[PDB]
Every structure is written in structure tokens, then in C-alpha cells.
Amino acid sequence: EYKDTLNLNTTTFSMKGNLSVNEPKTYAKWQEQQAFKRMQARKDNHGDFTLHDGPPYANGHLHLGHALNKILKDIVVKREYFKGKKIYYTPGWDCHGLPIEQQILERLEKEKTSLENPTLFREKCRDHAKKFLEIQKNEFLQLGVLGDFEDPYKTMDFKFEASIYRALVEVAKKGLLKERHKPIYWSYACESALAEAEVEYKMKKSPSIFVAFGLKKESLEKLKVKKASLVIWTTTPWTLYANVAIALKKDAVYALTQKGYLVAKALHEKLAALGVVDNEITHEFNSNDLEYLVATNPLNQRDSLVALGEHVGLEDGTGAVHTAPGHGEEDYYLGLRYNLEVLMSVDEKGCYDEGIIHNQLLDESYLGEHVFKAQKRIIEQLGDSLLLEQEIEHSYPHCWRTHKPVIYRATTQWFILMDEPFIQNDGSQKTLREVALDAIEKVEFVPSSGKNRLKTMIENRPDWCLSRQRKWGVPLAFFIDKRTNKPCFESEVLEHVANLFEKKGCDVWWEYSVKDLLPPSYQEDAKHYEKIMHILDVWFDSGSTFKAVLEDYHGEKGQSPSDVILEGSDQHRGWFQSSLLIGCVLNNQAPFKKVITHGFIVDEKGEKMSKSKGNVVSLDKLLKTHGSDVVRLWVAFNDYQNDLRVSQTFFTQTEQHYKKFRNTLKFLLANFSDMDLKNLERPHNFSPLDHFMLETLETISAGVNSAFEEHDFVKGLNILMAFVTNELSGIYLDACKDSLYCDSKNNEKRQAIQMVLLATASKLCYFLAPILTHTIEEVLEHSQALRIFLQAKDVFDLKDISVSEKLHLKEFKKPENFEAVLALRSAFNEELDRLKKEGVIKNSLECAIEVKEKALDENLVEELLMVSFVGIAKEKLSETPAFTLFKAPFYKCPRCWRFKSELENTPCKRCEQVLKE
Numbered sequence: 052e053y054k055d056t057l058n059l060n061t062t063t064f065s066m067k068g069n070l071s072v073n074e075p076k077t078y079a080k081w082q083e084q085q086a087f088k089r090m091q092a093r094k095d096n097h098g099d100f101t102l103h104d105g106p107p108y109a110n111g112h113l114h115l116g117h118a119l120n121k122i123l124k125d126i127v128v129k130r131e132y133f134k135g136k137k138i139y140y141t142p143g144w145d146c147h148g149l150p151i152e153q154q155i156l157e158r159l160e161k162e163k164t165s166l167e168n169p170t171l172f173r174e175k176c177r178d179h180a181k182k183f184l185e186i187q188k189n190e191f192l193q194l195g196v197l198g199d200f201e202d203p204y205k206t207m208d209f210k211f212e213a214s215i216y217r218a219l220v221e222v223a224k225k226g227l228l229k230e231r232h233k234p235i236y237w238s239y240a241c242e243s244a245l246a247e248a249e250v251e252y253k254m255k256k257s258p259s260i261f262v263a264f265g266l267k268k269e270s271l272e273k274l275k276v277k278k279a280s281l282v283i284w285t286t287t288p289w290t291l292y293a294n295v296a297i298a299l300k301k302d303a304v305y306a307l308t309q310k311g312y313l314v315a316k317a318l319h320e321k322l323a324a325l326g327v328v329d330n331e332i333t334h335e336f337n338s339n340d341l342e343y344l345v346a347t348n349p350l351n352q353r354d355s356l357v358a359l360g361e362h363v364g365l366e367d368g369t370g371a372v373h374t375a376p377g378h379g380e381e382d383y384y385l386g387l388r389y390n391l392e393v394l395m396s397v398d399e400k401g402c403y404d405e406g407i408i409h410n411q412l413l414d415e416s417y418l419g420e421h422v423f424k425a426q427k428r429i430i431e432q433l434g435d436s437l438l439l440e441q442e443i444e445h446s447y448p449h450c451w452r453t454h455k456p457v458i459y460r461a462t463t464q465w466f467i468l469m470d471e472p473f474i475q476n477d478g479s480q481k482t483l484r485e486v487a488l489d490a491i492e493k494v495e496f497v498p499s500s501g502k503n504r505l506k507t508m509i510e511n512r513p514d515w516c517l518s519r520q521r522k523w524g525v526p527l528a529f530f531i532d533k534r535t536n537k538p539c540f541e542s543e544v545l546e547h548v549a550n551l552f553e554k555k556g557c558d559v560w561w562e563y564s565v566k567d568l569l570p571p572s573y574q575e576d577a578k579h580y581e582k583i584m585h586i587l588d589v590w591f592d593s594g595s596t597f598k599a600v601l602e603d604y605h606g607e608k609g610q611s612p613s614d615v616i617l618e619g620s621d622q623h624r625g626w627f628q629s630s631l632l633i634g635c636v637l638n639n640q641a642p643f644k645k646v647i648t649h650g651f652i653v654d655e656k657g658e659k660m661s662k663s664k665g666n667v668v669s670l671d672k673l674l675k676t677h678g679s680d681v682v683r684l685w686v687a688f689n690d691y692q693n694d695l696r697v698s699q700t701f702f703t704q705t706e707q708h709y710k711k712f713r714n715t716l717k718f719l720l721a722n723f724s725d726m727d728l729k730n731l732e733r734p735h736n737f738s739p740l741d742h743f744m745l746e747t748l749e750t751i752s753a754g755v756n757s758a759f760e761e762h763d764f765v766k767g768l769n770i771l772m773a774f775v776t777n778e779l780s781g782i783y784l785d786a787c788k789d790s791l792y793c794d795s796k797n798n799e800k801r802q803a804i805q806m807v808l809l810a811t812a813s814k815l816c817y818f819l820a821p822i823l824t825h826t827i828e829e830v831l832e833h834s835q836a837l838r839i840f841l842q843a844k845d846v847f848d849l850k851d852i853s854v855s856e857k858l859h860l861k862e863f864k865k866p867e868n869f870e871a872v873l874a875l876r877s878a879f880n881e882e883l884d885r886l887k888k889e890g891v892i893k894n895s896l897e898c899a900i901e902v903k904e905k906a907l908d909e910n911l912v913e914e915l916l917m918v919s920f921v922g923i924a925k926e927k928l929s930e931t932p933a934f935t936l937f938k939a940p941f942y943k944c945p946r947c948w949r950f951k952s953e954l955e956n957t958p959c960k961r962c963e964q965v966l967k968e
């Protein structure tokens with residue numbers, strides 16, 4: 052009957068998050084109130100921070116990977132904002148290319164329709180990108196992220212298309228944009244060249260065959276043998292029609308078997324065990340003496356030159372390599388080395404064309420057949436020359452959006468050259484590969500291992516094929532002079548076109564005549580010029596975002612180079628590399644100072660998610676079930692630099708952490724809710740325990756901050772959680788509960804406790820604000836004391852505070868040392884544990900302790916162990932080397948339940964006083 056005489060100590064801040072209901076209201080408010088613009092306009096901004104957004108493709112709804120990405124960017128940006136900086140973060144969308152165009156192509160199929168008008172086709176692509184840009188923008192905002200989402204950048208904006216073109220212009224004028232004719236990746240499904248970032252290597256089954264090419268009569272006579280046939284190994288019977296040579300290893304021994312097969316001696320043992328060749332060797336020859344002999348192709352009876360390759364391998368195959376210059380890059384260079392024909396009779400759709408008849412390379416029945424469908428019939432046609440057929444599996448390149456296997460076709464395309472010296476901005480001379488490698492060494496990678504991934508790619512990469520044979524993209528908008536057969540790179544022409552794109556967009560390249568695309572100076576010679584109609588690799592679009600966004604807006608959307616970029620691990624093959632290369636051409640450095648890489652969302656078994664496999668976890672369902680602040684906490688509280696597995700068990704762990712933080716903030720708010728805000732002006736006498744908590748708060752705050760500075764949010768959250776769980780809840784709040792609930796509101800020691808709780812909630816708000824922004828906004832909404840103490844209207848006014856200044860602490864105050872008393876506490880609690888299960892007592896408050904160590908502050912002992920008496924009493928309960936435990940020789944107080952009453956059912960002296968107030 053004393054419960055209503057206690058301090059109420061409640062807050063309107065609720066235990067339950069109600070996140071599905073409350074979070075949309077917060078995020079809608081931030082949109083309506085233009086919170087991001089308010090952040091940028093903050094009057095006392097000091098220093099600048101630029102995160103340059105890498106642009107997601109404007110196709111589809113968001114998945115959990117996009118959420119991971121944008122949430123990490125948001126934590127990084129909000130950290131810098133709350134450190135006091137002016138922030139720049141303009142999100143963007145990647146609107147061109149097959150990620151958009153393939154969806155139009157597939158829908159036209161399903162509807163059984165076609166769209167051949169270029170302007171109308173580009174319009175359907177553009178409308179699709181516009182549609183999903185808005186969908187994605189709103190789904191991003193539902194995660195609580197803040198950026199310039201009402202003014203995002205778009206690669207389909209006319210000014211951006213011009214910026215991309217002007218970047219290409221800079222490459223051309225530095226001498227790095229050149230035509231090459233060679234075999235390259237070819238996607239037959241979309242009738243386009245491809246480069247590396249547009250291929251996905253996947254396991255594929257293939258025929259694997261060993262084929263005898265008999266030496267011609269005159270070559271047998273020169274070699275002085277009766278029978279000899281070189282054996283080749285190939286997995287592509289579809290290229291045998293284009294054979295012109297058989298390449299051997301230089302200065303290497305070739306064995307001739309009794310049945311007359313000629314293979315590398317080093318491989319004969321393996322080949323005979325396979326049954327490709329017979330076991331007996333009759334003669335050995337040096338490949339140097341075999342060069343310029345001639346064999347016969349069993350498929351079509353054509354000559355095949357015996358040639359010497361560069362670096363022919365002896366781990367695979369036979370040591371004799373079927374050479375088809377039209378369908379292999381190294382083959383092509385060998386063919387030119389020996390002035391051989393480049394046979395290439397495979398069209399843009401991957402089908403054999405009339406060249407096989409004109410050149411007598413393959414039977415006419417194959418005309419129009421797809422090369423992969425023809426292979427079975429080709430293999431059957433080989434007859435006795437087929438020595439062995441297997442089926443193998445190997446990693447094979449596939450088109451990134453049609454998912455069909457690619458082939459290689461000799462073709463003329465446009466490239467950025469990697470090993471071509473060009474004039475540096477400082478006047479020196481270096482190749483792009485050299486510049487990029489030097490640039491990488493100036494970039495910080497998080498984790499540092501990511502440097503090695505990008506560096507190895509730059510060390511090994513080939514020339515970058517830029518030209519694509521689709522319509523949705525930025526054209527390589529140069530004219531060829533027919534009088535010279537070379538491109539026109541005159542600045543007046545290039546600037547004229549760039550200005551037209553900036554005002555009208557690239558549709559004009561298809562619509563306008565050559566004369567109408569030329570400056571008036573040139574229009575009389577318009578008859579001599581023809582347009583290049585190829586469009587740029589979409590990876591060149593996105594590689595140019597630093598120029599189009601950071602440079603062309605002169606710092607208004609962030610500096611070049613950016614301070615941070617942050618993307619998934621596939622962007623070393625992608626956007627990190629394209630942006631590095633273009634930045635090194637234009638600026639001779641990377642357009643970013645730091646690269647943070649995150650892993651991929653994968654299922655509970657570590658496997659990739661796909662609608663095909665049935666293992667896709669829905670972002671919308673995840674948000675509905677847990678709320679965005681829980682999804683955000685899951686991101687921050689996990690090892691995001693490696694792949695992240697999604698499962699109910701891991702989200703249940705995160706929910707328990709969120710509940711612990713939330714329940715802690717509720718308790719804090721409840722227990723300084725009644726404090727007279729005049730307290731905030733005056734200093735207080737703090738107890739040793741108070742000081743221990745303030746000093747501990749400062750030590751853990753430094754550790755959290757250092758961890759968050761290194762982007763190790765797990766480490767920082769673990770420090771914060773341990774403080775919340777152990778020192779705060781376990782030690783301080785337990786020890787303070789009596790004063791908080793049972794001491795007078797005027798009690799100066801209670802007021803000091805409340806100031807410690809205020810300072811503690813203040814630091815929790817500051818450190819959690821980048822991660823749980825909605826929840827900290829809610830905390831401030833419900834606590835007038837915090838808003839006054841922090842001079843904060845809302846979460847966007849938070850700053851790191853000096854607890855020392857706010858609480859008026861003395862400069863040279865010597866820290867508490869609690870090692871001895873906390874060791875006594877743990878030892879007492881272990882002994883109390885044992886007495887409880889024996890039934891000897893129920894609670895620490897029933898006990899008296901006499902400590903043999905006279906050196907300890909006895910009131911601190913009583914405070915920390917929550918005994919009701921320090922000293923000697925009558926009934927001995929137990930004894931250790933450090934202390935003796937007795938039953939407290941008092942009654943339980945009916946108001947505070949401490950054993951401090953001299954009379955049964957009578958308020959103790961403290962409570963008596965409080966009740967009389």
C-alpha cells in the first residue's frame with residue numbers, strides 16, 4: 052500500500068516499436084519537410100564530405116541487395132553529417148543499355164510484336180527507365196535513407212548524355228580511341244559485341260573431340276614417313292570450317308606412332324591411355340622441322356598450314372592446336388603472322404552464311420544453321436578422322452542479359468587502348484595501364500584486400516571494346532570521312548554535336564541528316580561524311596558519372612575525386628574499373644579517394660538468390676515483418692564486407708538487440724522524465740559510482756567512434772551493447788533503482804543520477820542516429836529534457852556533446868578505480884547465487900556483509916552489492932576469505948523493500964522522511 056508513494060518514473064516512449072505503422076510517418080515527414088536539404092543548409096557546417104552514388108539500373112523493384120547498399124551509404128553519410136560536415140550525396144540511375152533494353156525485347160516477344168522505328172524504340176526504353184526510376188526512388192526512401200532523391204542524376208537526361216559524349220571526346224583527343232579488327236565476344240541473341248563486364252562465366256557442357264588432320268602427300272615425302280596425321284583437340288567443332296593452321300609448340304619433340312598419329316611426346320602417354328592414339332612410338336621429330344608442312348582438314352579437304360604458336364600448352368590437348376583466326380584472338384594474330392586467310396562465315400545471329408559456299412568451307416546444307424546446333428552433324432561428318440569424342444563441362448562466357456552463350460567473331464569495333472602511350476596532363480608520357488596501376492596505389496580500399504582484386508584486373512585486362520550494335524545508349528557520334536576512311540575528331544564538329552545532345556538528347560543522331568548534324572562550316576562537304584551508328588558500352592556511361600555529376604556541376608553535387616564510393620563486390624569487374632579507367636584518361640587519377648566494398652545477399656546456405664530457384668527473400672516482406680530500423684540494424688550489426696546469409700534466425704537475433712537498445716532508452720527517458728530542468732544549469736556532486744559511469748561512458752564512446760570511423764559497425768555496436776548490458780543495466784541501473792524510485796525528487800543524489808542518465812541517453816542517441824534514425828527521432832520526440840539538454844529540435848540537430856562541459860566536471864579530477872570493489876561484487880554474487888539455490892535467502896537485500904578489506908568505501912560496497920547492511924551481525928550465513936555474510940538484523944521496509952526498518956511493517960528512516968514531505 053506504498054506503491055503509489057514511489058516516484059512514477061514513466062515515459063510516453065513505448066516499449067513496442069510499432070515500426071510498420073510509425074516508420075512510414077517519419078519518412079513521409081522527412082520527405083515533406085525536405086530533411087536532406089535542411090542537412091545541407093545547416094549553418095554551422097564545417098568541412099565537406101562527398102559520397103558519389105553508383106547508379107543502379109532503372110529496371111525492376113529493389114531487392115535486399117539494393118537495400119544493403121543504400122543503407123550502408125546512409126550510415127556513412129549520416130556519420131559524416133553528425134560529425135559536422137556539409138554532405139553531398141546525389142543518388143543516380145543507370146538508364147541505358149540491355150538491363151533496360153532487354154526487357155523491352157522480351158515483352159515484344161511475349162506480346163508477339165516488333166518495334167523497328169529507332170526513336171519509338173528508344174522512347175519505349177526511356178519510358179521503362181522513367182517508370183522504374185520512380186519505383187526504386189520511393190522504395191529507397193522507405194528504408195529511411197537521406198539524399199538528394201528529389202533531384203537525382205539520370206544517365207538518360209539530355210545533359211548527362213552530352214556529358215558522356217564529351218567524356219568520349221576527351222578519350223579520342225588523347226589518342227586512345229581506335230578501331231581494331233579481331234575476334235571478340237559476340238552475343239548472337241542480341242546481335243552485339245560485348246566486353247568483359249557484360250559476360251557471366253557459367254558452367255556449360257560441351258563436346259570435346261580429338262581429330263586427325265592427315266599430312267599431304269608432299270609433306271609426307273619431305274618428312275620421309277609413309278603415314279602421319281596431326282591430332283588436334285577442340286571443344287568447338289563449329290570453328291573447324293574456319294581452320295587455316297595447326298599450331299605446334301616451338302622447339303618441342305613430337306612423337307609419331309605406329310598407326311601414324313603425330314602428337315607432342317610429352318602428351319603421348321596421356322593420349323594413349325585415353326585411347327586417342329596407339330601406344331608404340333616409331334619416330335620423334337622437332338616441331339622446328341615440321342613448320343610449313345601442310346595437312347588436310349577432314350571436314351572440308353582444305354589445306355592447313357603446320358605453324359609454330361606462341362606459348363602452346365602441354366597440360367591439355369595434344370600439343371597441336373586447331374587454329375581459326377576468325378573465331379579466336381590468339382588464332383587471329385597467328386594467322387596474320389603467317390599471312391593466312393581469316394575465314395569468318397558466321398553472321399551476327401550466330402548462323403553460317405553464304406561464305407561457306409563461296410569459299411567451299413562447309414557443305415551447303417549448313418547454310419543458315421546456328422553454329423551450336425550444327426555441331427552434332429559436323430561431328431558425325433568427321434568419320435574416321437574422329438579419334439575420340441567426350442563430353443566435358445567448362446566455365447564458358449554467357450551474355451549478361453540474354454543469358455545465352457557467346458561466341459567470337461572477327462569484327463571491326465572501337466576500343467580504348469590499354470598499352471598505347473598518351474600525353475599526360477603534366478606533359479609526361481604513359482600508357483593507360485600504367486596510369487591506372489599508379490592510380491590504384493593512391494586509393495584506400497575497405498577492406499584492403501579489394502585493392503588486389505582491382506589491381507589484378509587492371510594488370511591482366513585487354514583493350515576495352517566500346518561499340519555496341521543496339522539503339523538504347525549514347526552513340527559514338529563521330530563521322531567518318533569517306534575521302535580518308537578515318538574519323539573526324541575536329542573540335543568544331545565534336546563540340547557542335549555535343550551541344551545538340553545537351554539541348555535535344557541523342558535522338559537527333561538517328562533523326563537528323565549528316566548536314567544537319569554538322570556545323571555550317573562543314574555542310575558543303577556533308578556528302579563526304581557518314582555516321583558511326585554504334586552506341587557506347589553502358590559501362591562507359593556509368594564510368595563517366597564522376598564527370599557528368601561531380602565535374603560538370605562544379606562541386607554543387609560533390610567534389611571530384613569523391614571521398615567515398617561504396618558498392619558490391621561485383622563492381623571491381625564493373626563500375627570501379629570503368630570509372631578508374633575513364634578517370635585516368637581525363638584526370639590521370641582515380642575519381643574516388645576510397646572504395647568500400649560489400650558482399651552479396653545470399654540465402655541461408657550461402658547460395659545466390661533467384662526467382663528460378665525459389666529462394667528469394669522479399670524486401671517488402673522483410674520490411675513488413677521486422678521494420679526498417681531492424682533491417683538497418685541487421686546490416687550494421689553484421690559482417691557486410693563478406694556475403695550475408697538471410698534467415699529467420701539471424702533477424703531474430705537482431706530483433707533482440709533492437710529491443711535491448713529500445714528498452715534501455717525507454718528506461719533512461721522514464722527515469723529522468725521528472726527532473727527539474729533547472730538542474731541543467733548547475734553543477735552536481737557526483738558519487739564515485741556516478742563518476743565511474745561517466746568515465747566509462749567516455750571510454751566506450753571513444754571506442755565506438757573509432758570503430759565507426761573505420762566503418763566497423765559490428766565492432767562499435769558490440770562495444771555499445773556490452774556497455775548497455777553490463778556497466779549500465781547490470782551495475783548502475785540496478786544500484787540506482789532504490790534512489791530513482793524511493794528517494795525524494797529533491798534529493799541531490801537522485802538529481803545527480805538523473806544527470807548521468809541524461810548524459811548516457813545523449814551518447815546513445817548520437818552513436819545510434821546514423822543507424823536507427825527513425826528510433827532516435829522518436830526518442831527526441833518523447834523527451835523534452837533531452838531536447839533541451841542537447842539543444843535539439845529533432846534528430847538533425849544532434850551533435851557530439853562534451854559531457855565534461857555539460858555536467859561542469861572538474862578538469863583534473865582523478866579517475867575512479869573500481870577493480871577491487873567490482874571483484875568483491877562478482878565474488879559476493881557468486882556466493883549469493885549458491886545460498887539462493889540452497890534456500891538460505893532470496894535476495895542480496897536480506898544480507899549483511901562484513902568485508903575483511905577495510906580499504907573499501909563501505910557505502911560504495913553497500914551500493915554495488917545491494918546488501919542492506921555493511922558490518923557485523925548476529926546470524927552467520929556463510930564465509931569466504933574476503934567477507935562474511937549475515938542475515939540483516941532489520942525488518943523489510945514495506946515501501947522500499949530494503950531490510951532497513953527497526954520495526955515490522957514500518958517505513959525505514961529514509962522512507963519515513965520522504966512520506967512526510
Ligand SMILES: CC[C@H](C)[C@H](N)C(=O)OP(=O)(O)OC[C@H]1O[C@@H](n2cnc3c(N)ncnc32)[C@H](O)[C@@H]1O
Nearest residue numbers: 105106107108116120145593618619626650651652
Ligand atoms: C554501381 C552500379 C553499376 C553502375 C551498375 N548499374 C549495376 O551494377 O547496377 P545494379 O545491378 O542494379 O547494382 C547496384 C548495386 O547493388 C549491388 N547488388 C546487386 N545485387 C546484389 C546482391 N545480390 N547483394 C548485394 N548487393 C547487390 C551492386 O553491387 C551495386 O552496388
Ligand SMILES: [Zn+2]
Nearest residue numbers: 944947959962
Ligand atoms: Zn524504506
